[PDB]
Amino acid sequence: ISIKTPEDIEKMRVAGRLAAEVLEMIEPYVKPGVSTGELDRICNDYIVNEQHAVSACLGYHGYPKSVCISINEVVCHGIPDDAKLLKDGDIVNIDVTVIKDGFHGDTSKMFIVGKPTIMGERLCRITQESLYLALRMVKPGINLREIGAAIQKFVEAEGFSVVREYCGHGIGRGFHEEPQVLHYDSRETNVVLKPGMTFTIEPMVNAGKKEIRTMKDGWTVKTKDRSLSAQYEHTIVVTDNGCEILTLRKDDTIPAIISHDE
Ligand SMILES: COC(=O)CNC(=O)[C@H](C)NC(=O)[C@@H](O)[C@H](N)c1ccc(C(F)(F)F)cc1
Ligand SMILES: [Co+2]
Ligand SMILES: [Co+2]
Ligand code: NA
């Protein structure tokens, strides 16, 4: 597994901040009646013309848009569409990845449009809380297995399920690098964290059953039972005594630097 230098890590601070700032920028546009196609153009224009960066998703394995915008029962990889309008009660993930100065920053959050439904709000909250509990566990010497097991235990106790596919991932000069960061317990996982590892945690949580389905368009992933699904993602670096969140936003309610030292 690659170990980032202080120079590499500073570049990941910059890229992570940019990816966060896309999400802070787009918020006032996420309203009933807006199209997801429009949101994607606003994001790409900002990334290119203001941040002077590029979207990692655009063209990636042929993907036609710059961000992924996933609504309701869509689990991930929702394709921005000029005809797809947001409406009251929708839960919406926007997942951003930018490359700046050769390094990637990858982050997503949920937006609830108009008046929340109670179940949508709870699903989003439990999903963020599962990410936060995982972030609290990251420090050198901990095994990724312990973190995946903990996300799953927490989510399942709420009556929700964890998507097994699409895991978190190492990240740096490459969009996806070792390790795989599973959001569930597996005997295969034996990665003892070391300072300078950079990776994402990005749990997808379904209100219903865990199983998923890819649509005929070749991209869009939905819950098999058409239950709601939510995701949040941060890029982090492991430090000598904990971690540092590289994609933190003003609306996050966890500190950027988490220290396990007395
Ligand atoms: C088996 O299919 C896969 O795992 C393809 N990879 C992913 O979906 C990975 C896990 N997704 C991520 O890392 C996301 O956080 C990331 N922002 C992203 C989102 C979409 C894509 C896509 F490939 F669809 F363009 C690639 C990467
Ligand atoms: Co992402
Ligand atoms: Co990712
Ligand atoms: Na969803």
From Swiss-Prot:
Q: Which UniProt keywords apply?
A: Aminopeptidase, Hydrolase, Metal-binding, Protease
Q: For binding substrate, which residues are annotated in this chain's numbering?
A: 77, 97, 176
A biological process (GO) of this protein is: proteolysis
- GO cellular component annotations of the record: cytosol
- Taxonomically, the superkingdom here is Bacteria
Q: GO molecular function, one example?
A: initiator methionyl aminopeptidase activity
Quote the record's binding site residues for a divalent metal cation 2. 106, 169, 202, 233
What EC number(s) does this enzyme carry? 3.4.11.18
Question: How many and how are cofactors bound here?
Answer: Binds 2 divalent metal cations per subunit. Has a high-affinity and a low affinity metal-binding site. The true nature of the physiological cofactor is under debate. The enzyme is active with cobalt, zinc, manganese or divalent iron ions. Most likely, methionine aminopeptidases function as mononuclear Fe(2+)-metalloproteases under physiological conditions, and the catalytically relevant metal-binding site has been assigned to the histidine-containing high-affinity site.
Instruction: Name the cofactor(s).
Output: Co(2+); Zn(2+); Mn(2+); Fe(2+)
Q: Which reaction does it catalyse?
A: Release of N-terminal amino acids, preferentially methionine, from peptides and arylamides
InterPro entries, from UniProt? Creatinase/aminopeptidase-like, Pept_M24, Pept_M24_MAP, Pept_M24A_MAP1
Binding of a divalent metal cation 1, residues: 95, 106, 233
Class in the EC hierarchy, top level = hydrolase
Q: What is the effect of changing residue 77 to A?
A: Reduces activity 100000-fold for the Co(2+)-complexed enzyme, but only 2.6-fold for the Mn(2+)-complexed enzyme
CDD domains named among the record's database cross-references: MetAP1
Spell out the PROSITE patterns in the cross-references. Answer: MAP_1
Q: Summarize the subunit comment.
A: Monomer.
Its job: Removes the N-terminal methionine from nascent proteins. The N-terminal methionine is often cleaved when the second residue in the primary sequence is small and uncharged (Met-Ala-, Cys, Gly, Pro, Ser, Thr, or Val). Requires deformylation of the N(alpha)-formylated initiator methionine before it can be hydrolyzed.
Q: Which family does it belong to?
A: Belongs to the peptidase M24A family. Methionine aminopeptidase type 1 subfamily.
- NCBIfam families in the record: met_pdase_I
List, alphabetically, the HAMAP family matched.
MetAP_1
- Protein name per the record: Methionine aminopeptidase
Give the organism, scientific name.
Escherichia coli (strain K12)
Q: Source taxonomy lineage?
A: Bacteria, Pseudomonadati, Pseudomonadota, Gammaproteobacteria, Enterobacterales
